[PDB]
Each structure stands twice: as structure tokens, then as C-alpha cells.
Design a protein around this nucleic acid. Structure first.
Ligand SMILES: C[NH+](C)c1cc(NC(=O)CNC(C)(C)C)c(O)c2c1C[C@H]1C[C@H]3[C@H]([NH+](C)C)C(O)=C(C(N)=O)C(=O)[C@@]3(O)C(O)=C1C2=O
Ligand SMILES: [Mg+2]
Ligand SMILES: [Mg+2]
Ligand SMILES: [Mg+2]
Ligand SMILES: [Mg+2]
Ligand SMILES: [Mg+2]
Ligand SMILES: [Mg+2]
Ligand SMILES: [Mg+2]
Ligand SMILES: [Mg+2]
Ligand SMILES: [Mg+2]
Ligand SMILES: [Mg+2]
Ligand SMILES: [Mg+2]
Ligand SMILES: [Mg+2]
Ligand SMILES: [Mg+2]
Ligand SMILES: [Mg+2]
Ligand SMILES: [Mg+2]
Ligand SMILES: [Mg+2]
Ligand SMILES: [Mg+2]
Ligand SMILES: [Mg+2]
Ligand SMILES: [Mg+2]
Ligand SMILES: [Mg+2]
Ligand SMILES: [Mg+2]
Ligand SMILES: [Mg+2]
Ligand SMILES: [Mg+2]
Ligand SMILES: [Mg+2]
Ligand SMILES: [Mg+2]
Ligand SMILES: [Mg+2]
Ligand SMILES: [Mg+2]
Ligand SMILES: [Mg+2]
Ligand SMILES: [Mg+2]
Ligand SMILES: [Mg+2]
Ligand SMILES: [Mg+2]
Ligand SMILES: [Mg+2]
Ligand SMILES: [Mg+2]
Ligand SMILES: [Mg+2]
Ligand SMILES: [Mg+2]
Ligand SMILES: [Mg+2]
Ligand SMILES: [Mg+2]
Ligand SMILES: [Mg+2]
Ligand SMILES: [Mg+2]
Ligand SMILES: [Mg+2]
Ligand SMILES: [Mg+2]
Ligand SMILES: [Mg+2]
Ligand SMILES: [Mg+2]
Ligand SMILES: [Mg+2]
Ligand SMILES: [Mg+2]
Ligand SMILES: [Mg+2]
Lengths: 50, 111
RNA sequence: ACCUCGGAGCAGAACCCAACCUCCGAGCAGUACAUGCUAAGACUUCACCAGUCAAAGCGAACCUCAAUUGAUCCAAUAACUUGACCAACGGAACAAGUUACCCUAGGGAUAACAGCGCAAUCCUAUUCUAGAGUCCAUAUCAACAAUAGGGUUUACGACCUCGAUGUUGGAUCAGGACAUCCCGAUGGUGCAGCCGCUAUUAAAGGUUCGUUUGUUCAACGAUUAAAGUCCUACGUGAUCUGAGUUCAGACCGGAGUAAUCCAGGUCGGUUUCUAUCUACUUUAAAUUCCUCCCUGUACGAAAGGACAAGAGAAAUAAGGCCUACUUCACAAAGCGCCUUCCCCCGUAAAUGAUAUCAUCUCAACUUAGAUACCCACACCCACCCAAGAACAGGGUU
RNA sequence: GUACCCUAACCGUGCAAAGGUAGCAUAAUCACUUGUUCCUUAAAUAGGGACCUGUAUGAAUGGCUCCACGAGGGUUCAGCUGUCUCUUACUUUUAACCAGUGAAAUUGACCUGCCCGUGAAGAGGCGGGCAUAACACAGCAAGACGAGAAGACCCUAUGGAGCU
RNA sequence: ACCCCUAUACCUUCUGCAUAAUGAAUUAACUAGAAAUAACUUUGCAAGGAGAGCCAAAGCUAAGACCCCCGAAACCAGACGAGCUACCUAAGAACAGCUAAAAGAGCACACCCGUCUAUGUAGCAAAAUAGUGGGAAGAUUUAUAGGUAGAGGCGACAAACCUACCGAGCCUGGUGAUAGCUGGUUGUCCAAGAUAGAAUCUUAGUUCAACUUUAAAUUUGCCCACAGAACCAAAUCCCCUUGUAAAUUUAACUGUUAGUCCAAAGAGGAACAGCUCUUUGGACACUAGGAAAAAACCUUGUAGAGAGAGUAAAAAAUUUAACACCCAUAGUAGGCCUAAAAGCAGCCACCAAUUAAGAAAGCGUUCAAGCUCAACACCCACUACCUAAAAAAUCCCAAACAUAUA
């Protein structure tokens, strides 16, 4: 999202162009377990959003 | 970790025990249900766990009928009086069409 | 951490359906006092036990809730009835630690080492062009992100091995990859020269000695052209070591009532094997540094300061020999002496079409671009030998 | 909380039975740890001296010095030497050959090769290729997951035993 | 006879073994299924039967036919052991030489022990040899008898030693201890035969169910037509025809209940794993052909002989980047801002002369200046394929071949 926002904002003409997202903000939670942790012991905590 | 406990209960084995067109005897349970999915109709009684049993012996028929609750059922009457005009509520009902007559008159004496 | 019961998802629509899967709850409360008796027919938590609904009838009247629970024996009671967080919840009437002093039966059904699978982690290359680089994306570095590869780390899995696949470093001998540390060739530069940085090609040859530490590593001293990165059962213990690490003894600090223990430190501590089979046991083209001159030349304001060509001197490696020196003495050796010869491909140019210019050309085309050793062969009884384990070989005029 | 950092002679508060005293101190000592400084060496994670709530030292769980002693552990001057740079020569045993006597572990059968791949995941025996007359003797230890010992580590068993 | 072609020993264990997992040198001999309750079959008699007892709403009596082997560490009882060793008792013995003459003193023999190294490791030796060491007038060493014994003794505590494996001696007996664990289990031939789950000091086992087997009795069993199954996707349930021949019940039991890949729907993990967990369906644990070897992918199943034939699945294709030429005066250093910012630092506007040039699209300048593009003319004509890598470790890996009619 930051790559797209920065590249489009740099490259556009703010006097004759306009840009909108057709994709919502990151909402689906992606979870990761601790590093070096064996298999099992419950589901890992929420890491980020996609 | 795994702080989620419980949820180890088995399936209730509920549902339809007698489908459409099945010959049924008096007292046979037609359906078992946690909520009122199928409603009692003609010659079908309801037991206090909302179970459906055949009050008479015959053929099980599943129909779709209008729903008029008892005027003492407060939640249902509130839903009805909050239903817009021109709309009739529908439910699925279970009936037993009785197969035999109640009895016969036959000769027993020649007095 | 959990152990029993219920609801929702996974499991979308008859039933059922797991995970140390995702959430929410339960171990009651309230009403009634016919919450009395009895009896067709059914359902059923995949067995059983247990649990659930109920027509009619007798007698009266005219239960809500989702789970809301515990068997048998036995105990209390005249009787009816009532007794466990028996919660490890199908419940043994009542029993904890520790073992490195340990033992047995097994298990690669199961961990440690190794291999294997995977690539989260780690490493590399490319794409994109923000940014840094006085300016300038692309001399050099490089964000967000993308694409691909590698199998050196830390993991993860538990697939061979527990009727043994012996272990960390070191010695010895090294085989290989190139992602090249040096030596070779080339392109670019923010390359004047010397030095550098970056990229292409190149695995023939080489890649030091010491102090501390068991160390791999790491720090330091002195060099060198350089002191490469890895794989090889973290190469190699039937070739070696045993400093470390995880047997039995002991001490210190801590834990524990104690036995005893510590993924903490310290002192000590048995490393067996007569090789059956495979494999193998003599394959002659050497590299590098330094000195001189070129030359204080090119270059450069100066300071600094080459590359080619050539000459010499070494060192290592390979092969060999004893004239002297030395260990020594009819001889074997080095600390001594002698000899050691080919290229290597990245690219830079000329002519010239497709495309009547130009263009180094996956256009036709032009240029840079081995010899040596060995080689005959029933004299053989025997003897000698610089030849040799035996055999074989050479000499015996 | 209080004297620029550090640190409190000092003040306040709470608990205990008492709140670690003298002495020593980076230890034969949990992590930090190769603590900081000086000597020793060209170079020191070694050794000695010093500082040090040692945030887990400490007084018959004996604390701290000191004289002798120690096949105890560590450091070191000088000398010595094949310990090594870097190995060589000789003698004896062993060895090899001839003669006499003559075992043991081991052994499914073997007419018992190399590379790459495959496969119960590391092949002499499978697939593709390569190599290939037969047979002794000496030597080597890379392989036969070589021999030995129903793993000395780990787990399991409603298997044991010792101790508290 | 070899040379050709084909062919991955056996048993056990396991999801799966050529496996580099177990056992086996070989021969001969020896070496491992014992029985009841019931049932079934065949007789005898029959409302009774059996040579008392017992059973009997066709039963009773008799026979047949069904249930292994080896192995612990252990526990207990009674004996035997202190000729080794631990300690003690009785009465004995030995200790050269030197220092100094006193010493659990020093050097050092005999003697006792065993620090370190080397050899040896089925050895000379079930702990030795060689050198080097500690002590050697004492808490010393040693000969002879005697004593303390295992629920113990003894111990300058090493949980040491007690007749060459002492965390509790050895022997005999209970004892053919026990083993949910490993190993083994011996003639021929045929047939049926593959894994939902629940409890459990249970997940290495067992019981019930499920599946499987046999013998009987009976009638429906699978595939399924329409209609039917709830509010908050693939499909399934039910189901008459139809095609077929199985199904249910009764009686008797064993065994399986430690599971692997592939396709699909998901969950966990990294939208890792030959990873783990459910479900549906295959295959494997049974044959054969193919994908190189090959478990799980594809083809195919019911068994024999044949020197017959038709077929099934079944052999990888791809090779990429040329792009113009010629020309350019000028209203103006448009205005504002700034020291200047001149087309090009930032703003407003974007007109306008030549035939034809943006109040300028990139560069480039402190600013300037400069050079390319868009523009005239020029002319054959914009010629326009719209695409894109590489690495590892013993030695590349069939040989090859573009062209003779499916
Ligand atoms: C080889 N040594 C260092 C050793 C090591 C371990 N532990 C290991 O296996 C550790 N190895 C690792 C590092 C984990 C790979 C060990 O476990 C052992 C032993 C030694 C033996 C000695 C045994 C001895 N016998 C059998 C030769 C013996 O007679 C006695 C005795 N004193 O009587 C033993 O103590 C002995 O049986 C023993 O206990 C040993 C080990 O257990
Ligand atoms: Mg549930
Ligand atoms: Mg369940
Ligand atoms: Mg049931
Ligand atoms: Mg009634
Ligand atoms: Mg339980
Ligand atoms: Mg239970
Ligand atoms: Mg100990
Ligand atoms: Mg054992
Ligand atoms: Mg591993
Ligand atoms: Mg910039
Ligand atoms: Mg598994
Ligand atoms: Mg093992
Ligand atoms: Mg073996
Ligand atoms: Mg290269
Ligand atoms: Mg290794
Ligand atoms: Mg080896
Ligand atoms: Mg031991
Ligand atoms: Mg010692
Ligand atoms: Mg050895
Ligand atoms: Mg062999
Ligand atoms: Mg002493
Ligand atoms: Mg002989
Ligand atoms: Mg196989
Ligand atoms: Mg192989
Ligand atoms: Mg083999
Ligand atoms: Mg040989
Ligand atoms: Mg072995
Ligand atoms: Mg075993
Ligand atoms: Mg058990
Ligand atoms: Mg027990
Ligand atoms: Mg017992
Ligand atoms: Mg297995
Ligand atoms: Mg084995
Ligand atoms: Mg085998
Ligand atoms: Mg085994
Ligand atoms: Mg005695
Ligand atoms: Mg004395
Ligand atoms: Mg003495
Ligand atoms: Mg004693
Ligand atoms: Mg002790
Ligand atoms: Mg002890
Ligand atoms: Mg037995
Ligand atoms: Mg069959
Ligand atoms: Mg259990
Ligand atoms: Mg078991
Ligand atoms: Mg699996």
C-alpha cells in the first residue's frame, strides 16, 4: 500500500489527475507463532493485516 | 497455551426420523429439534423438548401453512403487530393423514 | 496446560466427523406441591451403562431453563429416603519425592549425532527507479516491493538406524564446487600516475608462523603475492589424540526437610580389533616473489611515480645424486648439491549485407587467436649384486 | 528523596526473631565475564598485585593470615634435550621366506566392479551408461551403515530395586 | 557349459524392507495349541431320557470337534561361606647403609603400595610387564590360628569390602515366579476375507460396537420417479419403477481395533515439509503392463497349457531485442518573486510575426550561454517481429536422427 501510494503520488500531476483506491484497507488478520516454537500449543498471536 | 476449553460435546443426532410418505404408527417420533423448525399440524403432537410424534397412525405429510400465533404469545404477537400490511407469515407443518377408520359396526347377536 | 457437561464455527443442505483448533458458557436459580399412579408406541450422543418424548387409562383440575451432573459396594434410617471438586468427573476404600550407584523387557512406534524432506531464518543474482553520490538513479551505494536460485546457520518434521550409524576441536592425508583471497586476461570509473572501487573470464598453481583460550571462533604480535568461501556422515578415531563435553569420587554458590539436583564453575577419570570382500599401492610441459636497468621515463602543478622488453638472484613444489659440508662411513641420508619446457578466450579491431550510410558477424568473412621415457630374451644348477619381503631383475669372459 | 555524575554522613516509611558483624574478596563460586588497573610476554580468555552490595562471600556449613609438608591443581627464571623446525642412521624384537606344531572372534548364499540417478530417504546386486582373460603374494584402511557387546544417552512398561 | 533375454535371497517386523532393520556357517537329531460353558453334526430312545444323584412346554443320553514355546531384573524361606578382603583377638617375625643420634624426622636397600608414560587388550596376566615413582622404626609390613554373615557384618564413608559382574553374597527350594514386552511356532490343496467408534492408571493392551467367517430361517436388499427435509457450493436423506440378487433375522465365535500416498473440501504450520488433524473418494497393504529404477499415478483384475490374434495405458515441446533523416529566425531577459532567476527555482496567463517553431518536452547552465524534440520544407517510409537469465560441491550422461505417403 505504501509503495503504491508513494509511487502514484510522486508520479501524478495533482492539477489534472486524480486517483482512488478500489481496495479496502488491510482488514484480514494474519497470525504468526513464536520463532523456534514446535508444532502445536494453540494458534499464534495476530501479527499483521492484509 | 490454547485457552479455549470445552466444545467437546457430541452431535445430538436430531432431525427428521420420518420423511414424506412414510407409514407411521401412533406414538412414533416424527422429528427431534432444538428449535421449532417444523411445526405440529394435524394429528401430530409436540413434547416438551419440542419433539414431534404421531398422534394417529397413517402417512406423514409435510406442508406449508400460514402462521397465526396464540394471542397470549407475547413475542410472536409483537412480531405480528410489527409485520407490515399485506404480509402473511408462513411455516412448515407436519401432518399425519390417518389410514384406518376408528372402527366398524359388525353383527354380534340375533336377539 | 488440560481431564466432566452444553452452545456456535470448522462440519453451507438427513445423520455423524478430529486437532495442546477458533469463541462462549455450566457444577444453578425460580415456581409448584397430583412435581400422583399407570401404560401403547418410539428416539438415543455411534457399544453397554446412562439419558429423552409420549397417546390412552385411574385419580385430580376445570413447570421455566442449555449444560446445571457421579455407577456399584458400603454407611445412616423403623420406613421413605439421603450420602463424594469419587473434578484424573465410567469413579482403585486408603500410597509422595529421588536415583549420575542403578537394573530389566523393549522402541528408530520416540528424542540427542549424522543423513533425508522444507526453506520460516540465512545467502546470492536480477527487475523497478525513490534516495545518497556538488549536479547526475545506474563510477559506487541503495528504501518500499517484485522475480528467481542455493542448501553453509538457527529451527521445523520424526522417514532409515536404539540385537549401537562412536562425539567437539587438533594431527595426518586430502577429493571437489566457484559464489576468486593471490597470480593471468578484459570492460567501466567521480581511472592523470602509484594505489584503489566495480563488473566479465579463468579452479592449472598457491593460500604463513606464533601468545591466550579445549575450542571451532575471537583478540593480539610478526610477515606474505595472498593469509578465500564452502561441501565431503558439521570429510577422515578397524590411522592417531582425549584438552572439552553428559558415568561412577569431591568441592564452591544456590535449590530442597532430606535423599538429591543445577540447560553453573572447578580437580580426577580404561579410546578393543590378527583385514575375509570391494577399492587402491611409480599417470617426464612448475609457479611465485625480489633486485637491476628501462627510469626518476611515461604521467603529473608539484608531491609522487609506472607498464611492456631484457638480465640476475632466490623461495617453494616435483624428480634425482652423494664431489665436498654434516648425521656418518664398502652404504644410507639432509641441514648439502643438480635439473625443471605449451597455451588458455573476457574482449579489442578491419571489410561488409539484411536496413545501397553506419554495424567486430548466433550474416557470409579477416586479425589478435608437442616432444621425451620404455621397447632383444627357455645360459641359469649354482654364486654375487648398487636388484629384491617371496617371486622377479642384472652380472658370472 | 537529600552534597554537579556516582554516592549518601542525613531524613521519612513499612516488616522481622535478628536484619550479614569482623575479616577477606571477580574465588576451586549462578549469568554478566575475556569486570577495571599495574607487572609478566614481541604478542596473555593464563599467572601474580590492586579496586569491588560478593544485587547468590562470610565466621566450628568455621572466617582470615602464617611455618613446614604434598606422585594434589595452576604460573614461571635458568638449564636441558628428536618435543618440534624436520627428520635420519644403526642394533634388537617383530617382520618375510623354509621346516615342525597349530587357535579365535566372524560367516544367509555369493560367479563379491566404477559413475550418475532411483529407492525404507547414504546401492557390489535396481535403471541408464562405462569397464571387464584367469589366479596368487606383500601392503593400506576409504567402504562393506565392518566384528564385539538384544545402546552406558532418550522414551515406554499400571516392570524392578537402592535411598529420603 | 557359458555368451543372448528376463529376474531387487528368505524369515520376522512394519504404513512401507533388496534394504546398509532382526535371525541364520552348514549337517544330523531334538524342539512349540492342553479344556470348559454352550452351540453344530451323527446315532439310540422318546413326553421322557440316562446303569440312582440330573435335566425335560422335544427333550435326554453317547460320541466327534476349540484353546502354544523360550526369556528377565525381582520377592521370600532354609542352608553354606571372613583359606580373598574390611575390622578385631592371641602369640610371633622383619626392617642393610648414610645424615643425627630426639623425631608417626630426611636420603636410601630388602619389603609394602601403585603417581605417570609406553606396551599389552581372547594378553604372560578375567588387571600383567618395563621404566618412572610414594613410603620404608611405624597410625609400618607380614606369617599362623581364632571371631564378627546377609532384614546382617565391617568400614580413617569410597554407599567401599564380605571367595575374580555386592545399591545389598552364594546355593537349594517356592519355581515351569511373572512379563499388556521381544523372539519363535513344524504336511498338501482350495475358498471367504482390510480396517465408523465408545470406555479404560488407557492410547505398546483389553471389552463392547463395526467389519469379517460359518451354519440355519425368512423376504425383500442395492440402483432409485415425482412429490417432500428452516428460519436465521459439490452433494445428501427419502424413494415407486427399472436392472439385478442380495438382504434381514437366528446360532457360534475368532481376528482387525500402533495406516500410507493421491485427487477434492477444509483446519493448524510458512497459502514449508515424504508435516499434523477431520471428511468424500481411489489405490496400496493381491496380479500383470506402463511412467527409467518405482507403494500410493495411469491401464487392468478370477487364476491352466499354446512356438496364435486384437487391443488398453504408454516416447515433451520450445530460441527471444537494428531504428528514421533534415532543420530551426523571432515580438521578449511575457509579467510577479528574487541578486539574477532569461522556455526551463516557484506562481498566473498561454497570445503572437514570418512559409514554419511550445510564452517550451527533455538536458544544460549561479544566472547566462549552449543542444535535442515537437514545426516548415524534404521524401521510398516509418520498414516497426512488442519479446527477457544464471549458479555447488566423486564423473556429462542412452546412441542418435529435421525430408519416402497413419
Ligand atoms: C567410556 N567411559 C568414559 C564411559 C562412558 C559412559 N557414558 C557414555 O556413554 C557417554 N558417551 C557420550 C559422550 C554420551 C557419547 C558410561 O556410561 C560409562 C563409561 C565407562 C564404563 C566403565 C565400565 C567398566 N567395564 C564395563 C569396562 C567397569 O567394570 C566399571 C566398574 N567400576 O566396575 C564401570 O563402572 C562401568 O561398568 C561403567 O559404569 C561405565 C559406564 O557406565
Ligand atoms: Mg461442538
Ligand atoms: Mg466429539
Ligand atoms: Mg444407541
Ligand atoms: Mg393422557
Ligand atoms: Mg481417569
Ligand atoms: Mg475417565
Ligand atoms: Mg557424583
Ligand atoms: Mg537394557
Ligand atoms: Mg536430526
Ligand atoms: Mg539526488
Ligand atoms: Mg506420522
Ligand atoms: Mg540408535
Ligand atoms: Mg547389526
Ligand atoms: Mg567466475
Ligand atoms: Mg565429522
Ligand atoms: Mg573410519
Ligand atoms: Mg555406570
Ligand atoms: Mg593424577
Ligand atoms: Mg584404536
Ligand atoms: Mg564386497
Ligand atoms: Mg602423603
Ligand atoms: Mg610356517
Ligand atoms: Mg522396493
Ligand atoms: Mg547412490
Ligand atoms: Mg550388500
Ligand atoms: Mg591382499
Ligand atoms: Mg557394527
Ligand atoms: Mg535393546
Ligand atoms: Mg498402561
Ligand atoms: Mg509397578
Ligand atoms: Mg511386584
Ligand atoms: Mg518404521
Ligand atoms: Mg541394527
Ligand atoms: Mg539383512
Ligand atoms: Mg529391532
Ligand atoms: Mg582372616
Ligand atoms: Mg620416617
Ligand atoms: Mg622417605
Ligand atoms: Mg582401612
Ligand atoms: Mg561420600
Ligand atoms: Mg555417591
Ligand atoms: Mg513366560
Ligand atoms: Mg480369495
Ligand atoms: Mg485407561
Ligand atoms: Mg500396553
Ligand atoms: Mg503423513
Amino acid at each position: 500500500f505504501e509503495m503504491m501510494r508513494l509511487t502514484i503520488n510522486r508520479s501524478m500531476d495533482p492539477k489534472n489527475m486524480f486517483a482512488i483506491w478500489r481496495v479496502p484497507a488491510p482488514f484480514k488478520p494474519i497470525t504468526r507463532k513464536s520463532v523456534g516454537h514446535r508444532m502445536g500449543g494453540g494458534k499464534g498471536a495476530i501479527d499483521h493485516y492484509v | 497455551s490454547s485457552k479455549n476449553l470445552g466444545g467437546k460435546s457430541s452431535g445430538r443426532r436430531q432431525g427428521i426420523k420420518k420423511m414424506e410418505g412414510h407409514y407411521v404408527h401412533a406414538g412414533n417420533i416424527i422429528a427431534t429439534q432444538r428449535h421449532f423448525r417444523w411445526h405440529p399440524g394435524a394429528h401430530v403432537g409436540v413434547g416438551k423438548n419440542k419433539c414431534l410424534y404421531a398422534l394417529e397412525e397413517g402417512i406423514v405429510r409435510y406442508t406449508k401453512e400460514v402462521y397465526v400465533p396464540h394471542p397470549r404469545n407475547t413475542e410472536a404477537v409483537d412480531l405480528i403487530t410489527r409485520l407490515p400490511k399485506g404480509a402473511v407469515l408462513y411455516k412448515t407443518f407436519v401432518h399425519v393423514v390417518p389410514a384406518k377408520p376408528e372402527g366398524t359396526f359388525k353383527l354380534v347377536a340375533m336377539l
